[PDB]
Design a protein around this ligand. Structure first.
Ligand SMILES: *[C@@H]1O[C@H](CO)[C@@H](O[C@@H]2O[C@H](CO)[C@@H](O[C@H]3O[C@H](CO[C@H]4O[C@H](CO)[C@@H](O)[C@H](O)[C@@H]4O)[C@@H](O)[C@H](O[C@@H]4O[C@H](CO)[C@@H](O)[C@H](O)[C@@H]4O)[C@@H]3O)[C@H](O)[C@H]2NC(C)=O)[C@H](O)[C@H]1NC(C)=O
Ligand SMILES: *[C@@H]1O[C@H](CO)[C@@H](O[C@@H]2O[C@H](CO)[C@@H](O[C@H]3O[C@H](CO[C@H]4O[C@H](CO)[C@@H](O)[C@H](O)[C@@H]4O)[C@@H](O)[C@H](O[C@@H]4O[C@H](CO)[C@@H](O)[C@H](O)[C@@H]4O)[C@@H]3O)[C@H](O)[C@H]2NC(C)=O)[C@H](O)[C@H]1NC(C)=O
Ligand SMILES: *[C@@H]1O[C@H](CO)[C@@H](O[C@@H]2O[C@H](CO)[C@@H](O[C@H]3O[C@H](CO[C@H]4O[C@H](CO)[C@@H](O)[C@H](O)[C@@H]4O)[C@@H](O)[C@H](O[C@@H]4O[C@H](CO)[C@@H](O)[C@H](O)[C@@H]4O)[C@@H]3O)[C@H](O)[C@H]2NC(C)=O)[C@H](O)[C@H]1NC(C)=O
Ligand SMILES: *[C@H]1O[C@H](CO)[C@@H](O[C@@H]2O[C@H](CO)[C@@H](O[C@@H]3O[C@H](CO)[C@@H](O)[C@H](O)[C@@H]3O)[C@H](O)[C@H]2NC(C)=O)[C@H](O)[C@H]1NC(C)=O
Ligand SMILES: *[C@H]1O[C@H](CO)[C@@H](O[C@@H]2O[C@H](CO)[C@@H](O[C@@H]3O[C@H](CO)[C@@H](O)[C@H](O)[C@@H]3O)[C@H](O)[C@H]2NC(C)=O)[C@H](O)[C@H]1NC(C)=O
Ligand SMILES: *[C@H]1O[C@H](CO)[C@@H](O[C@@H]2O[C@H](CO)[C@@H](O[C@@H]3O[C@H](CO)[C@@H](O)[C@H](O)[C@@H]3O)[C@H](O)[C@H]2NC(C)=O)[C@H](O)[C@H]1NC(C)=O
Ligand SMILES: *[C@@H]1O[C@H](CO)[C@@H](O[C@@H]2O[C@H](CO)[C@@H](O)[C@H](O)[C@H]2NC(C)=O)[C@H](O)[C@H]1NC(C)=O
Ligand SMILES: *[C@@H]1O[C@H](CO)[C@@H](O[C@@H]2O[C@H](CO)[C@@H](O)[C@H](O)[C@H]2NC(C)=O)[C@H](O)[C@H]1NC(C)=O
Ligand SMILES: *[C@@H]1O[C@H](CO)[C@@H](O[C@@H]2O[C@H](CO)[C@@H](O)[C@H](O)[C@H]2NC(C)=O)[C@H](O)[C@H]1NC(C)=O
Ligand SMILES: *[C@@H]1O[C@H](CO)[C@@H](O)[C@H](O)[C@H]1NC(C)=O
Ligand SMILES: *[C@@H]1O[C@H](CO)[C@@H](O)[C@H](O)[C@H]1NC(C)=O
Ligand SMILES: *[C@@H]1O[C@H](CO)[C@@H](O)[C@H](O)[C@H]1NC(C)=O
Ligand SMILES: *[C@@H]1O[C@H](CO)[C@@H](O)[C@H](O)[C@H]1NC(C)=O
Ligand SMILES: *[C@@H]1O[C@H](CO)[C@@H](O)[C@H](O)[C@H]1NC(C)=O
Ligand SMILES: *[C@@H]1O[C@H](CO)[C@@H](O)[C@H](O)[C@H]1NC(C)=O
Lengths: 321, 162, 321, 162, 162, 321
């Protein structure tokens, strides 16, 4: 008659690593690393992202005519831009402080577009021939929809003196631009005046742009260049435009209605018609694991990213053969 | 293991014991079988559960990256940004992997300890009244029926009586 | 007759946490986290901080007339600025590379102010009517005390050609500015010349400021703007000023006499009449603990900041009921 | 605990023993009382002291933040700066909290070990001359007076004599 | 140490035992000498080797700095860059130093454990047939020649025979 | 007759530290920290570094005549510049985006220099009197060898209109500059035209430099200043130069033939005639240790830098006296 002390064993093949030994078979274990995703771009808590598709953020904000899909976008959870979107600046040029603006959009969930300077209200200047074959729409020449390329009217460009006042409650994103023509002849043709300027003033802003006229390489068949600028107009503050040529004026601006959590995600994926509480640039995550190894840039209620291939905790004891 | 019981003086585990992590096997004239020790098993369960939740909790306040764009003449600060994000991910990856390695070692040792301690609890009861076989087992000098056996699992084994 | 082995117990209720169990009562423990401060701004090793109160760093350096308290400040241990000080730039404008200058002050403990261009020495220009109602002092119009707003004398602004030489042993912080008037009429009224400039040269510096004349919003009732610039003049090097208008000239500059450890601390607190070896923006720390959880930005011989609410080491053993 | 002594086969501690962490209680015809074991107690004290100072020392070379201002169009680098400072504070917070958790576990086990080892030191002296009661105590077969008891605490208990 | 054997109930090590980490010394009429226990020694060797390689492996994916120049008016970002590089080096320095401290503790305890377990393996064989001396040694009641001794090192010591 | 259990001891004096005890003597130990180096700058896998010696990176690229040693350098493993090289910009001035360029060189292993605008091809301008005593070569006045200081020819500076096209397969580093003379008289003497410009255009670049004419301190006996600029010319893209004075034109540019791993190392050391798989600014490392404590900035297959003085693992057991 005898009695023995002993411990559990089972058919488990689960292995855990330790400092002194690897691949120790244990009776029980708990995986704590999520390795799978759904491979899709999803709504985040039922709120669909803004998927720019082939448009870049600049083509969207300026109103590149190939980006009419985003003429009035609802509130978004996050934004998805491609690595090299084709529809950027149809007419070649630059976008001043572009990356500082993108950074601003990581904190923005909703824009409401509003008209600040009506197209019809340009009575001393021509405001309908500001169109280029570099920015085509349905076969015809067009231009960025949110700005107006003003040119001379009956061979005169009188000094422009306009001013908008932010009466509405929000902060306002105002955009404008300057045209850098190829040569002195092009300058005189479009604007008459040989030497020109655009001065822009707010409470904080005090700039004076002058066109640099130089020989350039063609890009989308254009020797000219457009430089685009922006500012945030605080509520109850006014912006003053003065110019005698080369001015790319704002027609529409964006009210900032919703601040908060958002991000600009780089991905070649498109919309997947799913919902999720955690999204990555390569797919969404549905798990209660503390960790995952899918991608570092996530948005939502996410596990913590680590670079491991395997994280498994022993719960049970060493399993015997 | 450190405590010498699991895969030590107790060669192997019991497929037959299904209702607990540690326990007893008895053999006598009436028959044989297994009985889980509920106390030490439950202690083990609580320990390991708390440990897991402790791990999960420590790691949930941790670095999370965000996208930042830079242009062609901001390469230095772009590189600064890349090296900073990668720097922290390496640190957290190292932390996670090490914690698991270390805590797995301790978990396996914990189980070894519980078994060793259970073996000792019984040894300290039996004293001179049983031969210590050297393999986890105790052969009794007296005949020990099922109620005698239960009393050993009780903790209420009357040594003087036998 | 018997002998027993055993261990200590006591009436301790101190608890420590472990990985496998929380709130384990132990006989002895050692708290290692400091949670208390005195709530005051204190001297640091007997050296009082510079407490700018309602002045900003710019109002102090330029000599905003509401900042006379800081006309000659002794050596400081650290500086304390508010989040939104009211007395910044009385006359609206900008301060070029302001944040790079503040960063310079984190390494500076003492300035000695000295006169580089005497106010009296402006014999071809008017140097006492450069005053604004935006910068009032005792009810009258005044201006930044360390610079001179030069205007035309008997309807003439002859080209200014001045030069200071850093003969003294230190590095010198030189400050100047440019006036951006509202319109062409204001320009001619103050300076006659329609188009103007200010050129500033050192061994390293080679700039040429031109005023941008534009319509602006009023701020403290001013349509104009002042842009302030700075440079560090190395010893034995000379600074060359050339201008024909709009020039805000230096009268006083600051010798940098003491380098070392300092910081600009943001706090709404004022002086507390205490001493301490470790200071935070919400109070001072007096303890030998390795850690504290009061605030990340400290100055002095400080414990290490952690974000915990509790750090307690077991020293004794598990205490039994 | 891992070593089975503290709150194991020794159910509880002694309010009565005030002059040390571990020690002996004796009972005989002359009376009873407690005696701290100075050697193992002092070893414990040194261990725990060194540990504390070791912890304090490791952590004193560690990240310390400084203020940096940025303007309205330096948001990216401001954010970089915020995420960098917060990144390190999380890392150090995690390090501190974990070190304490881990070292508390080890400290409690250390004490358990010292008690277990003291129990064994005495068991190995007494051998067959005392009954091992199963609860930390040893009942002697011979009468054992105060000098006999001291000799057991000495380490110089003449087994053959008895 | 935690397990009580090394510099505990076994006062000191053996200069005489050169062919292993743990083992036996015997004394009888035919003579005396040492014999390494190859099993437990080899287990120790593998453990410590794996540990070392584990340490070396964890640390090889870790922060590495690169030079970045900044001009006289980029002091903030230069300082950001300095504090970022130093920040990570402190973290890794702390990690390395701590890992070594912690794993040294565990390594010394591991050895203590192996010795304690070897002592127990032999104790559990000898049972009542030898006096447990209290110092690592076992004095036999029967005469035990070299083949008897080998059988104790074998694990195949026929208790009933003696 | 008795048998005893026991453990090894030896004559080892090696010590390891633990949390609870320091300087524990053990039978065996393993040092894992490398503390020694060879004190030399070495080839990295047989590939010699570019050791600029007394030249700075700017003096090398622009062709400072004191830097003829680096007129045609082979492929390098890394670059070694001193802290304060004497031969920088012989003629005083600035180098625009210099640090962003150095950062570009950390990813470059080889340049091939090529002629883009032949010196002989300047037929309407004088291209051999652009020489200064500040840039001497063998006792005579000279100038940066990779650029041409064009001055007026027979008292005329006709507008320059030149253009190079990147036909070759690589990216091209193009460099140019502008001269900032001391005064209006110097301007007219060298270039005739009172007011001048240089416009430079590519697909992305669109600049217009104007000389700032101001009184300056002499540096190497020069009141003038040269500002140097650069750009990377993508393959199959063309660069357009337009100017009417002050133009420092490119003669030679650098083809970027090899990208990859490199670095700019700061060190006062010179070439050591050794090989190594791991290099620091104070010497090379030959070891299989996981860690070292020599210097943070390494290049190659290196151990990990830590700041410790000592890292020693216990392998054996506690050694007894
Ligand atoms: C863009 O447009 C908006 C809307 O027109 C501009 O805001 C308005 O600007 C005017 C000045 O042009 C401000 O001043 C007038 O109104 C105030 C109102 O005072 C109180 O009452 C209103 C309710 O009607 C309340 O909303 C305010 O908060 C405030 O409590 C008058 O007091 C002021 O006249 C003053 O009277 C004081 C007492 O006698 C004197 O001390 C003063 O010296 C002065 O004479 C004047 O009539 C408006 O307050 C303001 N309205 C709003 C809704 O913001 C905005 O300025 C413009 N931006 C730019 C850049 O031009
Ligand atoms: C701001 O003002 C200061 C003070 O006026 C300027 O510093 C001075 O600048 C002058 C030139 O304008 C320098 O050169 C003169 O003095 C040197 C002195 O040489 C030695 O002796 C003095 C002691 O008197 C000592 O401090 C120096 O360290 C040095 O060892 C003369 O040698 C020099 O004349 C030269 O003689 C050499 C030998 O014959 C020749 O090789 C040279 O070609 C030359 O002819 C001349 O007379 C001063 O050295 C200098 N003084 C000080 C105290 O720094 C400073 O330049 C100015 N800044 C600007 C931007 O203008
Ligand atoms: C710097 O100099 C280089 C070299 O001169 C410039 O690159 C060349 O630029 C010309 C335009 O000036 C390009 O267009 C011509 O050649 C293409 C070639 O097309 C195919 O065939 C070549 C092989 O010969 C192959 O390499 C190409 O990949 C391509 O498959 C002609 O097609 C083109 O004419 C067109 O014909 C099409 C069909 O009829 C029409 O749709 C078009 O509307 C058009 O009429 C034209 O003759 C060259 O392709 C290009 N060569 C190279 C080797 O890159 C470069 O532009 C210049 N830079 C600057 C900034 O000026
Ligand atoms: C653990 O197990 C031991 C042994 O099995 C228990 O002892 C037994 O307990 C039972 C349950 O009450 C006793 O039953 C009683 O029997 C008497 C007469 O035989 C009867 O008059 C009562 O009505 C009752 O049925 C049994 O006598 C007793 N026997 C022995 C030999 O111990 C013990 O109770 C258990 N203790 C614990 C702490 O679990
Ligand atoms: C630890 O304790 C034991 C037992 O208490 C000690 O043994 C006793 O030690 C005392 C102290 O010297 C001895 O006293 C001597 O007595 C003899 C005759 O009785 C006398 O001639 C001497 O002048 C002296 O007073 C005592 O005899 C002795 N007795 C016994 C039974 O052991 C022991 O010394 C202690 N050892 C250590 C290492 O602490
Ligand atoms: C470990 O050691 C024990 C004791 O040394 C071993 O037992 C001995 O093993 C030897 C080796 O085979 C036996 O030799 C045989 O002897 C018989 C007659 O004496 C002979 O007919 C055979 O030809 C052979 O030589 C020896 O008898 C035996 N003796 C005893 C007392 O045990 C044992 O084999 C070893 N076991 C292990 C697992 O290492
Ligand atoms: C521990 O086990 C792992 C997983 O089974 C082993 O890694 C695999 O090895 C197999 C066979 O050599 C390969 O085909 C797989 O590619 C490996 N998979 C992974 C995820 O690594 C590993 O070799 C074992 N490690 C040790 C130290 O024994
Ligand atoms: C461990 O004890 C702590 C401190 O007593 C407990 O936390 C407190 O719980 C009480 C009662 O529920 C609350 O009123 C307090 O707000 C808590 N204080 C703090 C600082 O947390 C805690 O609940 C216990 N933890 C566990 C796991 O049992
Ligand atoms: C542990 O030993 C080290 C190394 O021997 C001791 O440090 C040395 O102490 C000697 C004598 O005091 C000094 O001359 C050396 O300068 C020290 N060297 C180093 C590298 O530190 C150390 O004091 C001992 N530590 C403890 C806690 O006992
Ligand atoms: C292992 O055992 C369980 C019994 O608990 C059984 O249900 C399961 O099918 C088995 N799995 C394998 C792979 O044999
Ligand atoms: C996530 O997947 C699990 C499968 O384990 C499922 O039970 C759960 O409903 C899913 N939740 C969502 C929101 O997709
Ligand atoms: C606990 O015990 C000590 C005796 O050492 C006594 O002085 C103290 O007052 C007691 N504290 C409490 C709260 O009972
Ligand atoms: C700090 O406070 C302690 C109270 O524990 C006091 O003894 C000490 O004198 C104080 N020191 C200073 C400098 O305030
Ligand atoms: C230590 O012992 C070894 C024998 O293994 C011997 O070769 C060596 O010389 C000794 N070293 C010292 C310093 O005594
Ligand atoms: C590095 O030094 C070791 C000395 O231990 C030597 O054996 C080896 O050949 C050396 N290798 C090189 C590449 O210098």
């Amino acid at each position: 008659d005898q009695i023995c002390i002993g411990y559990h064993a089972n058919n488990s093949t689960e292995q855990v690593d330790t400092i002194m030994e690897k691949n120790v078979t244990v009776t029980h274990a708990q995986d704590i690393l999520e390795k799978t995703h759904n491979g899709k771009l999803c709504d985040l808590d039922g709120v669909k992202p803004l998927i720019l598709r082939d448009c870049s953020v600049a083509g969207w904000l300026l109103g590149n005519p190939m980006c009419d899909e985003f003429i009035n976008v609802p509130e978004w959870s996050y934004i998805v831009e491609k690595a090299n979107p084709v529809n950027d600046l149809c007419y070649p040029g630059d976008f001043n402080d572009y990356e500082e603006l993108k950074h601003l959009l990581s904190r923005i969930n909703h824009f409401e577009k509003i008209q600040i300077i009506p197209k019809s209200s340009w009575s001393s200047h021509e405001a309908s021939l500001g169109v280029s074959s570099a920015c085509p729409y349905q076969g015809k020449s067009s231009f960025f929809r949110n700005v107006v390329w003003l040119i001379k009217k009956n061979s005169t460009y009188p000094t422009i003196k306009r001013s908008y006042n932010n009466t509405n409650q929000e902060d306002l994103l105002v955009l404008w631009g300057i045209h850098h023509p190829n040569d002195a002849a092009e300058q005189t043709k479009l604007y008459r005046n040989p030497t020109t300027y655009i001065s822009v003033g707010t409470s904080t802003l005090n700039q004076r742009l002058v066109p640099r006229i130089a020989t350039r390489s063609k890009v989308n068949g254009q020797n000219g260049r457009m430089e685009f600028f922006w500012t945030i107009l605080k509520p109850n503050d006014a912006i003053n435009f003065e110019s005698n040529g080369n001015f790319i004026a704002p027609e529409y601006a964006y009210k900032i209605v919703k601040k908060g959590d958002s991000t600009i995600m780089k991905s070649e994926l498109e919309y997947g018609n799913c919902n999720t509480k955690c999204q990555t640039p390569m797919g969404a995550i549905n798990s209660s694991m503390p960790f995952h190894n899918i991608h570092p840039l996530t948005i939502g209620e996410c596990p913590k990213y680590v670079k491991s291939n395997r994280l498994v905790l022993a719960t049970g004891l060493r399993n015997s053969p | 293991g450190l405590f010498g019981a699991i895969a030590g003086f107790i060669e192997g585990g019991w497929q037959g014991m299904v209702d607990g992590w540690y326990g007893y096997h008895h053999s006598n004239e009436q028959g044989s079988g297994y009985a889980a020790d509920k106390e030490s098993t439950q202690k083990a369960i609580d320990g390991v559960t708390n440990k897991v939740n402790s791990i999960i909790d420590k790691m949930n306040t941790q670095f999370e990256a965000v996208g930042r764009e830079f242009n062609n003449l901001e390469r230095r600060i772009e590189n600064l940004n890349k090296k900073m994000e990668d720097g922290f991910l390496d640190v957290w990856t190292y932390n996670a992997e090490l914690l698991v390695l270390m805590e797995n070692e301790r978990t396996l040792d914990f189980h070894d300890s519980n078994v060793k301690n259970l073996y000792d609890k019984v040894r300290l009861q039996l004293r001179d009244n049983a031969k210590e076989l050297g393999n986890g087992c105790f052969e009794f000098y007296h005949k020990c029926d099922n109620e005698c056996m239960e009393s050993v699992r009780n903790g209420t084994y009357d040594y003087p009586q036998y």
